């Protein structure tokens, strides 16, 4: 183990392409750009979504829907998250303290994802039917 006996892993360090350096390299002359046209030029190419002038897909289809501000302040909680809070009571504040939901979340819902194996009291959150069954079976209770 010396500064001149350390080697990188096999395959970790592929050499970069070097265009325009001779016939034998396989990228001489035109450097893979082919012959002429807009795409062979320096700075050449068409913008994203351009289709040659035909009405592009993102404009021949129609817009739809609206964006809901209330969705941005609502979160979902997994069953595996319940044991991560501090104290055995799960509410908005304890989830925020445990970094499970963001600081500006105002509404949260517990869903059946993962498992709960400890008794917990859920206060002030919505709980799905499956999650409520799992929590009560694990021995906890849900308070509105």
């Amino acid at each position: 183990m010396r500064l001149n006996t350390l080697s990188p892993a096999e395959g970790s360090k592929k050499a970069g392409k070097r265009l325009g350096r001779g016939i034998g390299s396989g990228l001489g002359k035109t450097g893979g750009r082919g012959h002429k046209g807009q795409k062979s030029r320096s700075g050449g190419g068409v913008r994203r979504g351009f289709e040659g002038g035909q009405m592009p897909l993102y404009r021949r289809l129609p817009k739809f829907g609206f964006t809901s501000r209330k969705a941005a302040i609502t979160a979902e909680i997994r069953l595996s998250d319940l044991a991560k809070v501090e104290g055995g009571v799960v509410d908005l504040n304890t989830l925020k303290a445990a970094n499970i939901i963001g600081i500006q979340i105002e509404f949260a819902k517990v869903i059946l994802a993962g498992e709960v194996t400890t008794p917990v009291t859920v206060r002030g959150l919505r709980v799905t039917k499956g999650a409520r069954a799992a929590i009560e079976a694990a021995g906890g209770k849900i308070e509105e």
């Binding site: 994203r48 979504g49 592009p56 897909l57 993102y58 289809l61 129609p62 817009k63 739809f64």
Partner: protein, 64 residues
């Protein structure tokens, strides 16, 4: 710098669970009396983007 979303594409495509995109069908904005109810009914649900167009959509929506 950060890549900029094509905002117009963001208004028309939404990413689905396996990574495709759903969109609203064309031809249901106006000139509706002369179209059959069957045709319009089949235009009402959202559809998925085709394979040949997925590349253009993905290019427009780097943060989708």
């Amino acid at each position: 710098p950060k890549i900029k979303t094509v905002r117009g594409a963001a208004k028309r495509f939404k990413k689905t669970g396996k990574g495709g995109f759903k969109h609203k069908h064309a031809n249901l904005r106006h000139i509706l009396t002369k179209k059959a109810t069957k045709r319009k009914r089949h235009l009402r649900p959202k559809a998925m983007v085709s394979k040949g167009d997925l590349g253009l959509v993905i290019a427009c929506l780097p943060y989708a």
